[PDB]
Amino acid sequence: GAQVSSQKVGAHENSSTINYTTINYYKDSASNAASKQDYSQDPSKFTEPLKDVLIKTAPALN
Amino acid sequence: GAQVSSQKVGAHENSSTINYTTINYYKDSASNAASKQDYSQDPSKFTEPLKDVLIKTAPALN
Amino acid sequence: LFCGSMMATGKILVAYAPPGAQPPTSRKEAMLGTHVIWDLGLQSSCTMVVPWISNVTYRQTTQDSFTEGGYISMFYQTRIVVPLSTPKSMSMLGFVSACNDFSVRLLRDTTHISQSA
Amino acid sequence: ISEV
Amino acid sequence: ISEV
Amino acid sequence: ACGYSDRVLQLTLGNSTITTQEAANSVVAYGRWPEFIRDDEANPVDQPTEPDVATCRFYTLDTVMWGKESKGWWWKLPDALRDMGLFGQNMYYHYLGRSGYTVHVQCNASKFHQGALGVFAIPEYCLAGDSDKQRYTSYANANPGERGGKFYSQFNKDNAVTSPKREFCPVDYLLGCGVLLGNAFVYPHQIINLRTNNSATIVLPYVNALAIDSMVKHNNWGIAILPLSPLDFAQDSSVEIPITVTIAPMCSEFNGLRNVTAPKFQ
Amino acid sequence: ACGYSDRVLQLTLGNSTITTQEAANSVVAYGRWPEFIRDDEANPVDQPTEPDVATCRFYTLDTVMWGKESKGWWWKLPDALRDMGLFGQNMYYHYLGRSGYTVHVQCNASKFHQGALGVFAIPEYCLAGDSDKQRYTSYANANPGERGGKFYSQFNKDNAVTSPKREFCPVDYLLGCGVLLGNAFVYPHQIINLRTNNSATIVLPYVNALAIDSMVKHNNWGIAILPLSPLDFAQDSSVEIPITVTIAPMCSEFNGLRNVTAPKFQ
Amino acid sequence: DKQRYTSYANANPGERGGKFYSQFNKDNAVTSPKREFCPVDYLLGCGVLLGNAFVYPHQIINLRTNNSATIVLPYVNALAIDSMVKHNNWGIAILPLSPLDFAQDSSVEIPITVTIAPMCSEFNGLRNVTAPKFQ
Amino acid sequence: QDSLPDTKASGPAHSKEVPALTAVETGATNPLAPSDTVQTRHVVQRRSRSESTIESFFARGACVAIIEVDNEQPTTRAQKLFAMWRITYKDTVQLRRKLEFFTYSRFDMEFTFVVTANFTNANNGHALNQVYQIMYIPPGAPTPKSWDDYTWQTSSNPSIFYTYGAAPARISVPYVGLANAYSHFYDGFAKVPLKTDANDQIGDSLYSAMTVDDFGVLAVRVVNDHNPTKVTSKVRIYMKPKHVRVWCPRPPRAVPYYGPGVDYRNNLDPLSEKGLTTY
Amino acid sequence: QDSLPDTKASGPAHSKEVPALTAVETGATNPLAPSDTVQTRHVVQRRSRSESTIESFFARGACVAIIEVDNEQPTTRAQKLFAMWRITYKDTVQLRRKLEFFTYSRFDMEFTFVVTANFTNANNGHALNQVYQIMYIPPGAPTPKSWDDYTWQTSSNPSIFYTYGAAPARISVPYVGLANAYSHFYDGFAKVPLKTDANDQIGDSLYSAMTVDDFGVLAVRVVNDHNPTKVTSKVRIYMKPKHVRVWCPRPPRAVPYYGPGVDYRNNLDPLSEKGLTTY
Ligand SMILES: CCOC(=O)c1ccc(OCCCCC2CCN(c3ccc(C)nn3)CC2)cc1
Ligand SMILES: CCOC(=O)c1ccc(OCCCCC2CCN(c3ccc(C)nn3)CC2)cc1
């Protein structure tokens, strides 16, 4: 059940990809740590809720 | 995710290559121990910064 | 955003001076840095982008001369001109937002909320 | 294992 | 494993 | 092609049609169009009522006047529509009701007038009260119906302890709720800036922590209209122009039918 | 397609951007865009300096006011830019300098104002003088810098012989140079007619009998702005609106570097 | 006695440069302080021993061998670009490792001339000119 | 990779395309980049938004309560031999403000308990190490009237037995909401006044409040019989939301909180004085 | 293998090649080996530079601070119920000197905390075990005015809760510099005096100093309410740089440090007396 992922290495030792291992010990997922591997998304639903979304080089009002 | 390397064995017991095992437990590489497997380099950038690097048996000034 | 009447016209210079020199007091000095000349008209609003021009890779969120960002200033390029029977005075509203290259780091507590004993 |  |  | 434009719209719902020749495009809140409850998100098991054209049409509320001292107006949904034709009847005959809305705010003037209306659609618009007493605004006061409420430039604490008013005291720069108005733009919105546009059109999806809820107990959306820039005209110091709000329910469905709810608004 | 127009332009050079919503298209003088000196037209053999974004950007000159009596304004290039940031420094540190220009003239008013500005870009704009003495205008007077000079409705001969003014006396209908103004239209030009457009935009190539010359000794282009039709408004007999000139060097290159030239403008 | 107190105008001599001293004279006048550097020669003006300065890029002009020294310097910094007005990248230190001497004339004097060239120069963040106060 | 977009090299412009002009009336933010208005170079961008993700923003244990409990001779007057706390993030301000950037949320909750104690009086002998019982009482369950009555038997309620001096206690709680998401804001009432009601108190309710007990209480006691000398203890509760999702953004609280709802009372003046043309 | 080069067997010479002669004026160190100047035998070399690698040189936890905090009756005069320390390697000399062999560095940082305590006075009863809170306050964040005010709520700032008697506390910190490397030396100013400034204090700055707060502070307190008797505690902070890289070598500090910059004051005489021809 071990889960293996690559670390995003910031300061590299003078010694390439480094990994870390995770194992869940409990049946209830609420007990689990946070994966912190979070996908992002477009702001458009907030920055552009327009029915006709227009392109920035064209006149906003036409 | 276990990582296995050879130890540089100093005093050998009266009993060949011996190994040690490493596993990273944390997502942040800052949390990691030091590998201590460090590659070296030439001193020349310090001992010889000359535009025309010359060979020791020839006259330094010519 | 120009919230004046439709009969009102004008040209405005909006600017950004990267840090290091005297903060602009005249349009003459402001012209020399990053700037947009905004012409008022059917498109009601104008956008000036302040480009990331920094020495450090990340600036601080607090005030600090070592990580200062520079100066924003606005001037009339010509002037507001109205006809008769038209208000000679009006409001300008302003807005700010981050571009898609913007990021932040080192999570901390805000000074913007607190609590008595 | 489940190495991602 | 990743035995070097 | 042909001659179409961002400024000219026709909205048709049921037996009602709205035209506008000076729009500033239109907003769909959070990028989501109204829709019915899906079987895999369904919770009440009884067959829903979907009144369709009889409720999902445009109701025009009483007109308010905008003048130089007007600090702002607010409305809550479904509350502003509680007495609106068959929508109101369906709302009060069922324990449960969900509905989305098309909100059309109307305010024309002239090329020589000046001013800008900020029109905001806020999910769960909890407002602040009168008193030292917390969370004490009465139901009848929280719900103005079609009339809506107003904003104030400052906080007048309802002092009379002994026989308390139990009303909201919505201060304008605090969006009536303890936050700064300038940030209200993270909410779905449009601006009616009089040199640009006659109107605002916001399409609202049903937003909630549940697929369906009690419309009588709970408002889903708040409509806040505040003058971002004050009304001005020529030199006449006491100008006044009408603001008219027309709202349409969309994808309305109701569960839990029984005898009619008659709330006490005294 | 989409919604584009002859009247709405954005000009971007270096860290500067100009927008205009009321243009009358734009002129490229003699159909030639600015360009660098080609190897087969090259004359100075030393490696040129090309400062690019630091000099080829928009410099805005001091605003002039247009009123009912305004007979006209003139400027010379590179002279109007001699004190403009790093362009000016490059001009005075090198014996040789060539450069083209984008000229943007700005003048807005209102739909009830009236008047028309004739904007002319003239190659080698030699102007007439003060006196009985021919070709006697002094360098310091010939070169007003950013200030520019003016036109007159008539020829006032500088009489004081004994201690002469050594200035130009540019008469308006003679284009300040012995010719009739109505024919100035054979020169690259635009008209700012206030009912039509806020501005004029003229792109100037380097024009000369040589590929490169002394910018301190010689002006390449003259900018003449004369009111073809006088400013008028409502019935107010003393109207005044600003004219603002913004100019950008283009494809600027310099040869013959040494210690800085410091001309005497006293 | 005051730490990190040298003034900007004193820290920056321009073309003139500064000098070294054989010993540490502490600017005593507290009340109206000079706010200058006191660079002692055997301490490389910075609390270290001069004999180790050879770990820095260098050449020796030994008069029986050579007229001159030529050092090519890369941009060195914790950043790719910085403020040139606020921060100096490189220091040029010239110290007599062995004293000038001639014939028997006890007061000899010969000129040292420093010629420097910028290389691969690039600039960002244009605006109105910085005019520092060197008074 | 999770780095932000690179800056594109952009040169001079003379065109009918005008990115710099727009109309905010539409409700839209102008999608501009530096290259739309100034000349830009190519920059290979390596920065990322890793630390500002929703999980990373809340991934921190925040203090939500300080429960005080005494262990002393059960005398006969209001004492603190046991204590009760209604579970909430609203007795504190810092996490409350963070959660309230959003209208709705959904998450699992991690509770960590720091327990400290001290001697209340100058001296009567000492105290042997204490074990603490932290019992969760969900709504409906019998609440304790006495520090050692039958409810502490805890046959079905979850309890933690913490030994003083041990590493701080820690448990996790599932998403336990009656709805599909937690409502940080509720514009409504739990009851409606009806025209046919007898007194008009039957239908009265607190504005914004939903259930009377929300999520129940934590009952805390010292399991130890009292020493001769009194020991006073404090249990500090740190709350962390994990496996977090949030909906509908909101303006942050700008003026001091005044109770569990959105009510404001004073310090309604958040902004400083600064001159219009002053940097 | 990481052993050093073998010694080659080298015999007599009579040649025009002269390794022994050179010209140090060039800036170069003569690359000579024993076999260039004396007759050598073949030696198979097994020695190595394993312990003098950059990582191995700094791979040790060094004492950088001693923070003292008291736990006692909050009276009403300047006390130590909580303490603050600006994070730095400059309050101590040993690690400072090691880091300063180099101009620039880049590394992750490991902090270990040893906490010791004792009774301040002859006797008033005793004290139950203490829990310590070590809070990091990054620049910009509200600093505490009181040992138990709202800032200690620590909703977003990282905090360590240490139990007295437990194994010493330990955490790791990422490379957190605003630049691509840490500057151990900065020949510059944070501000420049301009000719147009009003007072000439507007542009005044400390030589060599960069940001005002550098990296913030560690605020330390005892979470325990005070016992009747006073307990005094010391928190010793040990710092270790890990995953280390360094640039541009420098001469080591030869005279005693005098504050955070390169300033010297006295004991400017590092070298002993020894006669020129004395072994
Ligand atoms: C009132 C406003 O705040 C909220 O809406 C709100 C929403 C969600 C919240 O999450 C808490 C819900 C779970 C309640 C409790 C459930 C079980 N808990 C336990 C249980 C057993 C033990 C031994 N220790 N803790 C502790 C928490 C807390 C508050
Ligand atoms: C002033 C001169 O020294 C330096 O330049 C210099 C450079 C780098 C240094 O590294 C420290 C930077 C990180 C600062 C802190 C960041 C977080 N820290 C924490 C955080 C949380 C806890 C609980 N404990 N410690 C402790 C260290 C320290 C000093």
Ligand SMILES: *C(=O)CCCCCCCCCCCCC
């Ligand atoms: C998947 O996990 C198979 C490999 C297991 C490796 C040994 C795990 C040792 C830890 C056991 C965890 C028990 C948790 C209740």
Ligand SMILES: *C(=O)CCCCCCCCCCCCC
């Ligand atoms: C790679 O690691 C796969 C083999 C895992 C062997 C069992 C590891 C037991 C230790 C689990 C570490 C959990 C750290 C959060």
